[PDB]
Design a protein around this ligand. Sequence first.
Ligand SMILES: Nc1ncnc2c1ncn2[C@@H]1O[C@H](CO)[C@@H](O)[C@H]1O
Ligand SMILES: Nc1ncnc2c1ncn2[C@@H]1O[C@H](CO)[C@@H](O)[C@H]1O
Lengths: 293, 293
Amino acid sequence: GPLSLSVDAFKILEDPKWEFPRKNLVLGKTLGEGEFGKVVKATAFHLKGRAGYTTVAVKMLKENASPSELRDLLSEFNVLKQVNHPHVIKLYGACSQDGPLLLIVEYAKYGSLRGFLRESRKVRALTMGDLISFAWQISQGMQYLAEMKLVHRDLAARNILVAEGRKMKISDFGLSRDVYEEDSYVKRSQGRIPVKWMAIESLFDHIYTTQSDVWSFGVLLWEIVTLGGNPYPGIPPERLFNLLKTGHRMERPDNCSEEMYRLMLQCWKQEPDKRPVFADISKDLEKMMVKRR
Amino acid sequence: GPLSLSVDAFKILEDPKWEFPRKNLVLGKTLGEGEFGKVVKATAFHLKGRAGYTTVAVKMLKENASPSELRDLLSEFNVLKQVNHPHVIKLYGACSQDGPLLLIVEYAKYGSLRGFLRESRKVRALTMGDLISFAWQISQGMQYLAEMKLVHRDLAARNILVAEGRKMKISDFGLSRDVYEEDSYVKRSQGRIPVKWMAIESLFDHIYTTQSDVWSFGVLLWEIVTLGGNPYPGIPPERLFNLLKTGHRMERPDNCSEEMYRLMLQCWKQEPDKRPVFADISKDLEKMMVKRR
Ligand SMILES: Nc1ncnc2c1ncn2[C@@H]1O[C@H](CO)[C@@H](O)[C@H]1O
Ligand SMILES: Nc1ncnc2c1ncn2[C@@H]1O[C@H](CO)[C@@H](O)[C@H]1O
């Protein structure tokens, strides 16, 4: 089927640009379980011309992996090899021969944005300026992907990494799709994306575009302002069908300006063409930044 | 889409036979995460005519549930309401109004078969007679499902429960499908079943029938004889495409008779029509049982 064709090609085709000697990689502790497997911390000897050891993260499958998870790991490789942006996590290499498939990616010293924020306090002291900075960085990375006609489909604070210098890195591309041809991606079966982050047309009609990524960015903006809060708090996920279709949205959270909340609401308009594009969002966030000084 | 139609019907249609008052249910500790959500231990007051409290298990979604997981919870309800067999876990009720969707099911005091076996020793002392008994009980439950034209699709020791009296209960029906019409179920997208338990035609061609459940039962038979061992040990899941197609199978494990291993191999024939049916499997297991006395 499609996956056996992909697996075989991946193993057969050995892009020297990407293949890395397993004997030069040492795996350490588990950093998490992501969308399709586990991520561990690792170190890589003489990676990409760099002398000595480089600390990296490695994405791999678990023993009980399903075909869906394997597909997602290959999808993530296929996308990450094509993109390069200061706010998108970097692919360094892969191991595809003589052992389990491993992706070698940039290590983000602070982990996920949601973890980073939940460990902080609003005044780790983070100001509203810091939060707006985080959001803007993410919007920049998404402008780039959107220009590349890539839809991420799972934008959420758990899928943003926080690197050296508190720099945002969009990550977890296993579910991301190319929409160059048709400007949308449609999935006939049910999504494997949490209900509370999907745009209304994704949830009901299974349609994904850069405008549904904008809806998810609105939910991410709410996670940022609440320092890692849980969206639609106390609302069971299955109630989101009725809640969204009858025009309800999350309320303005505590320490959130009127301007920032209006931006979330515009991201959550029912009609996708009425939502901002990422270029608009970055502009809104820049303006809030300079107004605050 | 299909899921919003299902959700709405489930909430709207209130089969009095199944609906249970939330105020009569008390939830306790988490027993696990299953295929689509979490299972907790609970107690239910005046359940199904029974005086007083009854200990039960409750299946529910997590806050981050995807549409796939919600679909699977509804699928499980739809199937469990139709089946009744001493080796299939029982549905007692559901809560579908004024709060999160909850399925109320029979509590199995010993948990999963895989956990039960890994806590045991071969001589908890379990004899080969006990192990064969477990396998037979499971085969009986699968004969019944197969006669009902239901394919389970995720038969594995983690999805068998061990009740009072060490009685097997097949469980986790979220992925199970009706094949009354066509005698197969085909899934166009990738499966969410661990690669190491799927039949070769399920893995490559996405075809599921009662004969692919027979293949998975062979892997379950291997888990039983190894007291909870991990299938294809040390073999990455993505290598199973090449391994199975070139005709390789698991080796005979340590404390396993020649007859029992031949039964596993017959379950794993490449051609589904050459595998035994569950009625044959039960007969093989009964004969091994009486031969041992
Ligand atoms: N590249 C990475 N660098 C650091 N931690 C990571 C990386 N990718 C994933 N993680 C961690 O693994 C978890 C699962 O995605 C994340 O929440 C984060 O904690
Ligand atoms: N009906 C049940 N009774 C008892 N434990 C259960 C039940 N369903 C699931 N579990 C537990 O939850 C885990 C997840 O399925 C199982 O491994 C088992 O430990």
